[model samples]
Target: GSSGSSGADLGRKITSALRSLSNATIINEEVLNAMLKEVCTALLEADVNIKLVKQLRENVKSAIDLEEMASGLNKRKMIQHAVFKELVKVKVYSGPSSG
Candidate 1:
């Protein structure tokens, strides 16, 4: 019951897309951009709402807060975690469905 039930895959899909960044270096601009691009594509492929996707991008960007993260935290890991949470948090399904 896990493959596509209630569109749950979208959450996993978005998280998995950014999961690769878990071990990456955070200070690199290209790496982050590429990661975001990959995540964005994943959302688009899942038929995620365009507005939600765009908001995801914006929320992620702000969540990064890269230049001001506390030295006591694992920033890269934090960013990835935050993005996944935001993706999951933004999920909203409406219109028609099978009951």
Candidate 2:
């Protein structure tokens, strides 16, 4: 039997959260907070280290410049990429031998 909380499962949850953000018409602080909550919840459920999860949250928040971006900027893609890159950092420390 397969366990429910594998790395792949965690990845799917994170991706789903980002996709939800992508689907939003307005990308505001409220929406971003909801998305981050979802992402962090997934990480916590998957047994990721709490510190790493917090770091990811902060990193994404800092990477995004929603207030300063030009009108032509694709905010969705930018936010998606920022979240994706931070997720990659989590993988490095969550390997099979990390514990």
For TM-score, the strongest prediction is 2
Candidate 2 lDDT over 24-82, as tens digits, reads: 87777677778999988888997778997888777778788765655333788888887
Clashing residue pairs for model 2: none
Ten residues in a row with the worst lDDT in model 2?
Answer: 65-74
Stretches > 4 Å off in candidate 2: 1-6, 69-73, 91-99
For all predicted structures, in order, the TM-scores are 0.63, 0.73
Minimal lDDT window, size 10, model 1? 90-99
lDDT of 2 at 91: 51
List model 1 lDDT by residue over 1-99, tens digit each. 455456666656656656666656454446556777878777887777888778787777777775555443366667768777666565546534353
The parts of candidate 1 lying over 4 Å away from their true place are 1-16, 68-73, 91-99
Backbone N/Cα/C clashes per model: 0, 0
Candidate 2 contains a number of clashing pairs equal to: 0
